[PDB]
Amino acid sequence: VGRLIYTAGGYFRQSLSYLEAYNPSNGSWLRLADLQVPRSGLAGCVVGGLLYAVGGRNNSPDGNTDSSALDCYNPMTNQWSPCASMSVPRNRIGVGVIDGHIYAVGGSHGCIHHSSVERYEPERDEWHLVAPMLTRRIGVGVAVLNRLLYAVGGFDGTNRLNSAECYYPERNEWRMITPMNTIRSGAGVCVLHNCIYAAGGYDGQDQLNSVERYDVETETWTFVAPMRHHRSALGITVHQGKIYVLGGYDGHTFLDSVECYDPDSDTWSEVTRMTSGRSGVGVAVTMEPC
């Protein structure tokens, strides 16, 4: 569905269990049922009115467990319940939905930077591996447009990436696309109109406020207006033809700042701030609870 912006887990001193929902209609937040396990560098998505939290890591004071977890949140009940886990733990995961099916992309397992990719069947509650990406990517940005899944940037273990690639499901194939103008890991990646947006991230030197978009038709990346705050490991989603960026690290602060991009006016504005500063959250949109 679509009515609230849910932000699940994230990081500040350690991984966090928070689920809170923003209402752009009235500027209001709700605190909702905590994740059963705290998680940073996870991804959110939504299928048939249920919110999913996928992978990440528990950076606790008593150890650092990378997650293979798929946890399901029903806003009708305000409860989390476990779903089938993935083949492997994926911290700094990218996630995308094609026709009711969830794709989990790359991310890290301790030292290991994954190229692997796997697909969840909600009704059957089963995961199956698909074709690996051409490139190992963690902190990868992942978005779906026209039933094609795009994997943008991240970190291959040695180099941060400007590269990007496209999964064609009918062929179970990955092809390279035009690289970005800017090297980005931990970028906020989403879809709006006929473009894949890569917002912020890290180029190896500094946190970025630049936003560029890929036209799937023309195959070019153009910069748009930048965000006010430089950010990496930011949350990103789309509601009512607008990009929302939540949180991130600017090099000095875990930002509580929420920016909104208007593609009509090519401008960003501050629309609220989160109850607390935090990085590496999952974000997605569904019906309001209860």
Ligand X SMILES: O=C(O)/C=C/c1ccc(O)c(O)c1
Residue 5 burial class via C-beta count within 10 angstroms: exposed 0-12, middle 13-18, buried 19 and up: buried
Among 87, 228, 269, 275, binds ligand X (CB under 6 A): 228
Q: Which is nearer to Ca ion, 160 or 229 (CB)?
A: 160
Q: Which is nearer to ligand X, 158 or 205 (CB)?
A: 205
Residue of closest CB approach to ligand X: 226
Tokens representing residue 262 in the block: 């208007």
Q: Which does 39 bind (CB under 5 to 8 A by kind): Ca ion, ligand X, none?
A: none
Smallest separation, CB 250 to ligand X (Å): 10
CA 245 from centre of chain: 10
Per CB under 5 A, does 157 bind Ca ion? Answer: yes
Q: Which is nearer to Ca ion, 137 or 229 (CB)?
A: 137
Q: Which does 85 bind (CB under 5 to 8 A by kind): ligand X, Ca ion, none?
A: none
Q: Which does 209 bind (CB under 5 to 8 A by kind): ligand X, Ca ion, none?
A: ligand X
Smallest separation, CB 113 to Ca ion (Å): 4
Among 132, 169, 179, 226, binds ligand X (CB under 6 A): 226
Smallest separation, CB 125 to ligand X (Å): 44
* HEC sequence for the chain: CCCEEEEECCEECEEECCEEEEECCCCEEEEECCCCCCEECCEEEEECCEEEEECCEEEECCEEEECCCEEEEECCCCEEEEECCCCCCCECCEEEEECCEEEEECCEECCEECCCEEEEECCCCEEEECCCCCCCCECCEEEEECCEEEEECCECCCCECCCEEEEEHHHCEEEECCCCCCCCECCEEEEECCEEEEECCECCCCEECCEEEEECCCCCEEECCCCCCCEECCEEEEECCEEEEECCECCCCECCEEEEEECCCCEEEEEEECCCCCECCEEEEECCCC
Count residues binding ligand X (CB under 6 A): 3
| Contact string (CB under 6 A) for ligand X, positions 172-211, x = contact | -------------------------------------x--
Q: Which does 175 bind (CB under 5 to 8 A by kind): ligand X, Ca ion, none?
A: none
| Contact string (CB under 5 A) for Ca ion, positions 105-134, x = contact | --------x---------------------
Q: Which does 157 bind (CB under 5 to 8 A by kind): ligand X, Ca ion, none?
A: Ca ion
Q: What does the binding site for ligand X look like in residue numbers (CB under 6 A)?
A: 209, 226, 228
Q: What does the binding site for Ca ion look like in residue numbers (CB under 5 A)?
A: 113, 157
